[PDB]
Design an enzyme around this catalytic site. Structure first.
Site, PDB file in Angstrom:
ATOM      1  N   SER B 420      63.113 111.222  16.761  1.00 59.57           N
ATOM      2  CA  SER B 420      62.258 112.303  16.234  1.00 59.57           C
ATOM      3  C   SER B 420      61.198 112.588  17.053  1.00 59.57           C
ATOM      4  CB  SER B 420      61.911 111.762  14.892  1.00 59.57           C
ATOM      5  OG  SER B 420      60.952 110.778  15.003  1.00 59.57           O
ATOM      6  N   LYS B 463      57.849 108.856   5.640  1.00 58.75           N
ATOM      7  CA  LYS B 463      57.040 110.169   6.461  1.00 58.75           C
ATOM      8  C   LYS B 463      56.478 111.039   5.426  1.00 58.75           C
ATOM      9  CE  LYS B 463      60.267 109.917  10.213  1.00 58.75           C
ATOM     10  NZ  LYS B 463      61.323 110.416  10.812  1.00 58.75           N
TER      11      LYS B 463
END
Ligand SMILES: *[B]([O])([O])[C]([C][C]([C])[C])[N]C(=O)[C]([C]C1=[C][C]=[C][C]=[C]1)[N]C(=O)C1=[C]N=[C][C]=N1
Ligand SMILES: Nc1ncnc2c1ncn2[C@@H]1O[C@H](COP(=O)(O)OP(=O)(O)O)[C@@H](O)[C@H]1O
Ligand SMILES: Nc1ncnc2c1ncn2[C@@H]1O[C@H](COP(=O)(O)OP(=O)(O)O)[C@@H](O)[C@H]1O
Lengths: 171, 512
Positions: B420, B463
């Protein structure tokens, strides 16, 4: 006592062993540790089936009907099992091989073993060797240690009460 | 009176057999001797464990849902699973078969849930830890005690209790012993080394809890039904603390709500700045700490009543563990906020870029921040795609091909890895090359490929939590994580302007 062995075909060396352990048992006295360890030893020695085989049906068509109905596909396993049955027929005795199925997770490697043991009418035992690190889980401890257990194959022979029980070793 | 101790109780035949045999053998031996008391205790054990005594099972699902909902705030998924299990058991007639198992982070409610299940089914609860011994000893005066399951039977005086095998993954052969015990074909005949008489255990309910499913026996997991007890977001932790934890701590410390009060804002502050794990094991110790300091303050005489407030909590628990959570409030042209996924929650982190040499022979990218190999490769891919995107978008820029850039992910002591933050690095490079800051409260997370496709990521829950906690108003996710984002409580995703992209050009349109 000695009645657990009259149905069994006991070999001679184990006969000497059980005789000398019976002598030790008789000379010893109750409520003592040695009495108990010899009692456990003799119980395990008299629980092993020493001459018996399971009546294995070597009928081809019935075993093929058994296999083909509880598992789709998997032609190689069933062909190998049928050839195994044919060779057992020709030899006239109950024989034993060592097989290994390999494939992606969840394709019938474990249930085909049970259906196979049902087809051959053998007994069935399964135990995994996955995380084991010490060999005493197979070969057993020794009769002297404070907590003594005879392993994991003698347990098979005792609980299945047979000498050809189709042990499946997963993973 | 031994006959009276089992008169009204339904006894099998081969048990009354041994009872009368031992009574006759006890009349044989001499009272008050090293032979009499042993057989007396054995005959006591035969006449103590129940045989025909039961507990009327609670089959109704409404009452079960009520008793499960009373305690254990939250846990809606585990509750649904338990209700479905009770339905399958009611429809199957029995309750044997698979053995339930709860696994998750520690201090999350896996033992208390089994206690509440026992209270639900009206079964009598009993716990014995497996962190040989489950079979009892033999009557050669060495072990004059039966196993723990026989003691369960004696204690609960009921033939169908709910035994809890707590912490089954901390077990030491006990493995094959348990494997045989839980089996419903060996269940009816459980012969213990103390009582030569077998006992039917085919009516007891077994639950086992663990934390990791990496224990030694795999054929257990074939028979054990795994259920996952997840963590708690800060709101659920606050509700748990106000309803269950603080009352119990007050009871344990001898205080009461009038003397020492813990308001809601101080509890939210305590959770936000001290306890971030998935359980309530730390918050429990923290509230106990507060209550002990308060007990001292009221007994010693510093104050006849203490009122904790967010401006004196540090006087009770010390220095805050966590911090402002925003290194930047307004991002310069170079930096972009990405989201990280720990095992102890989420985290927000920025990606900084700068010129390394004066003038804005090809350029280079230097990368620091204790980055793993996957992350360095993600930086390389992002560099390539950013060059290509700037070429196709502003073909007269000359940046990113002639400039020497340095890319830093701050907090340089922390090792960080993962595919990511690819889109984050692309956005950082582009915003530096164009001299434009990205949208201000904008976070993003997504794996970019060499041509710009945005590939899915993991840990969307953590997240997104960490983004909402840092004041993010617009968040950008991969389109293949729409499911993961929408499988979140409505209060987590309530005020976020969310965008789901498949290529990077959409990210460019959102950020600039
Ligand atoms: B991403 O989801 O892969 C992400 C990239 C991050 C640097 C913005 N990785 C992480 O967040 C990792 C966990 C991980 C996920 C997937 C593969 C490998 C690792 N977490 C961290 O790097 C981290 C950073 N700071 C603090 C804590 N953890
Ligand atoms: N042809 C088939 N017929 C019936 N069941 C099958 C078949 N193939 C796979 N299965 C299922 O797969 C499972 C067993 O998978 P298994 O061989 O144990 O995989 P692994 O041991 O690699 O995890 C059983 O639930 C079985 O029902
Ligand atoms: N959802 C919840 N509602 C109420 N109390 C909870 C909840 N989750 C955890 N607790 C409390 O937190 C503690 C959790 O400890 P426990 O679950 O027994 O540890 P473990 O999960 O290692 O067995 C218990 O005292 C329990 O009362």
């Amino acid at each position: 006592f000695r009645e657990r062995l009259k149905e069994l075909v006991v070999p001679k060396h184990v006969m000497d062993v059980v005789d000398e352990e019976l002598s030790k048992l008789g000379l010893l006295d109750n409520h003592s540790s040695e009495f108990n360890v010899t009692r456990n030893y003799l119980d395990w020695l008299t629980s092993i089936p020493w001459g018996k085989y399971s009546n294995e049906n070597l009928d081809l068509a019935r075993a093929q009907a058994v296999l083909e109905e509880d598992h789709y596909g998997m032609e190689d396993v069933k062909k190998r099992i049928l050839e195994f049955i044919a060779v057992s027929q020709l030899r006239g005795s109950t024989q034993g091989k060592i097989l290994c199925f390999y494939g992606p997770p969840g394709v019938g490697k474990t249930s085909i073993a049970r259906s196979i043991a049902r087809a051959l009418n053998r007994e069935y035992f399964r135990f995994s060797v996955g995380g084991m690190t010490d060999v005493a889980e197979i070969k057993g401890h020794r009769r002297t240690y404070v907590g003594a257990m005879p392993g994991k194959i003698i347990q098979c022979l005792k609980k299945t009460k047979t000498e050809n029980p189709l042990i499946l070793i997963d993973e | 009176k031994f006959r009276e101790r089992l008169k009204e109780l339904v006894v099998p035949k081969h048990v009354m057999d041994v009872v009368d045999e031992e009574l006759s053998k006890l009349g044989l031996l001499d009272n008050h001797s090293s032979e009499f008391n042993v057989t007396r205790n054995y005959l006591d054990w035969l006449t103590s464990i129940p045989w025909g005594k039961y507990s009327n099972e609670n089959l109704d699902l409404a009452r079960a849902q009520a008793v499960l909902e009373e305690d254990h705030y939250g846990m809606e998924d585990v509750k649904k699973r338990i209700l479905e299990f009770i339905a399958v058991s009611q429809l199957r007639g029995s309750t044997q078969g698979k053995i339930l198992c709860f696994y998750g982070p520690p201090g999350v409610g896996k033992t208390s849930i089994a206690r509440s299940i026992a209270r639900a089914l009206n079964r009598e609860y009993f716990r014995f830890s497996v962190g040989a011994e489950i079979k009892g000893h033999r009557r050669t005066y060495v072990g004059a005690m039966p196993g723990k399951i026989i003691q369960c039977l004696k204690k609960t005086k009921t033939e169908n209790p709910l035994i809890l095998i707590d912490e089954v993954d901390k077990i030491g052969d006990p493995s094959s012993a348990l494997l045989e015990l839980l089996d419903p074909e060996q269940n009816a005949n459980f012969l213990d080394h103390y009582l030569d008489v077998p006992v039917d255990l085919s009516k007891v309910l077994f639950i086992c809890t663990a934390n990791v499913t990496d224990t030694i026996p795999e054929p257990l997991r074939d028979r054990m039904e795994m259920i996952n007890v997840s963590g708690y977001v800060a709101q659920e932790k606050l509700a748990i603390a106000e309803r269950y934890l603080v009352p119990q701590a007050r009871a344990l410390c001898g205080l009461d709500e009038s003397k020492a009060k813990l308001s809601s804002d101080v509890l939210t502050l305590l959770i936000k700045q001290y306890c971030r794990e998935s359980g309530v094991r730390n918050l429990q110790k923290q509230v106990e700490k507060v209550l002990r300091k308060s007990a001292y303050k009221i007994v010693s005489g510093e104050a006849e009543s203490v009122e904790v407030t967010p401006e004196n909590l540090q006087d009770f628990v010390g220095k805050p563990v966590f911090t402002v959570e925003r290194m930047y409030d307004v991002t310069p042209p170079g930096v972009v906020m990405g989201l990280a996924w720990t095992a102890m929650g989420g985290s927000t982190l920025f990606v900084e870029t700068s010129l390394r040499r004066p003038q804005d022979k090809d350029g280079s990218l230097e990368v620091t921040g204790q980055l793993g190999e996957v992350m360095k490769e993600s930086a390389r891919i992002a560099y390539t795609f950013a060059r290509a995107f700037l070429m196709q978008h502003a073909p007269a820029n000359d940046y990113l091909v002639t400039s020497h850039i340095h890319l830093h992910v701050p907090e340089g002591a922390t090792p960080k890895d993962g595919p990511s933050a690819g889109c984050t690095i692309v956005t950082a490079l582009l915003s530096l090359a164009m001299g434009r800051p990205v949208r201000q409260n904008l976070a993003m997370t997504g794996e970019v490929s060499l041509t710009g496709k945005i590939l899915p990521v993991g840990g969307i829950k953590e997240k997104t939590i960490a983004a909402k906690r840092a004041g993010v108003t617009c968040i950008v996710l991969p389109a293949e994580n729409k499911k993961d984002f929408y499988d979140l409580a409505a209060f987590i995703t309530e005020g976020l302007e969310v965008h789901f992209v498949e290529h990077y050009r959409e990210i460019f349109d959102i950020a600039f």
